[PDB]
């Protein structure tokens with residue numbers, strides 16, 4: 515009934531060009547079995563959406579990586595939000611929602627936009643830059659650690675820690691095992707910055723600790739929720755902004771449309787999230803026997819959701835492989851769907867919008883002018899190096 519495939523979706527060959535293998539996974543059937551790792555897979559939009567939206571059957575508290583927390587010890591104490599199910603999930607989620615709220619966005623927007631305009635002006639003075647290190651990484655580094663309230667010393671640990679977190683959702687391949695081998699100094703730094711005295715007043719970290727007296731979370735929960743933001747909030751935006759710039763570099767017609775109407779910036783970023791799907795994959799674990807797209811999956815089974823494949827499924831999308839900045843993107847699953855849908859999506863969209871607005875207003879052309887190098891990670895899709903010449907408007 516269920517087709518068995520030997521595709522390794524965590525192999526470097528797959529990361530280097532996932533699209534043929536993703537079509538193979540979709541067209542093999544609504545549910546496949548991946549013999550390489552002994553997990554079920556779903557790569558069509560319909561089944562990915564269905565799994566995301568049934569958290570009771572497809573739970574998160576046994577881990578959203580390959581490892582089953584019921585069988586192995588997690589590599590660090592479990593997340594109180596990403597790796598929790600309702601009802602334990604509900605109040606931590608409510609707190610991060612209020613911390614990363616519309617009102618917080620209103621407080622930080624003008625500074626985030628100024629930093630974006632400043633970065634693009636700086637990059638235009640150089641002309642030839644690396645859109646990864648010099649833009650996708652430098653811009654989030656210039657705003658997010660400060661918005662968290664982190665001290666200056668030690669910020670060089672943040673991207674390495676994120677790379678570790680995202681590799682650790684994967685199977686025990688060399689990417690994962692190498693990351694864990696090198697983890698100890700990054701864990702030590704991060705865990706220390708999560709304590710209330712180390713988080714500057716008014717930042718996201720202090721706000722989490724401020725919410726510990728409402729009955730939603732206790733003081734001893736606040737450090738691990740700060741940990742959630744220090745795990746998630748930087749490398750995601752690096753690869754979302756990188757995705758958008760790479761799209762604009764490859765599709766000059768869409769850069770030209772964005773220049774002519776800079777208010778398309780927010781949707782241009784959203785389409786880049788659909789088109790590249792920088793967060794590629796998450797797992798769930800079945801809590802019972804279940805029928806999904808005609809197949810029967812037993813209890814205690816890992817299910818791998820291919821978010822990026824779902825976002826290119828022609829059963830759901832017209833011209834899925836076209837970057838279209840005026841596409842109706844609502845319903846894409848690049849930020850998830852349902853009770854765990856990205857609680858940081860307003861930060862992500864703010865950063866992406868203000869960066870693409872700065873490009874739309876200041877840049878006439880983005881031309882790749884050097885070798886493109888991909889960055890390999892078990893969960894994140896994105897580039898290591900993207901050499902571009904920026905032409906000023």
Ligand code: HEM
Nearest residue numbers: 595596746747750754793848849850854856857858861862
């Ligand atoms: C382009 C950028 C981003 C993308 C594509 C993205 C993608 C996602 C996805 C797919 C999920 C669902 C996980 C699941 O269902 O198991 C998620 C959840 C989450 N994201 Fe993001 N994310 C981004 C940015 C951010 C940022 C900037 C932050 C923090 C400031 C953040 C914090 C979180 C948290 C805390 C969760 C867990 C929510 C929950 O379990 O209820 N994310 N994200």
Ligand SMILES: O=C(O)c1ccc(-c2cccnc2)cc1
Nearest residue numbers: 593595596741742745746750793
């Ligand atoms: O440590 C955590 O709780 C945590 C770690 C990573 C994420 C995450 C992953 C992908 C996109 N957005 C957020 C979320 C939460």
Ligand SMILES: [Cl-]
Nearest residue numbers: 590701704705
């Ligand atoms: Cl840690």
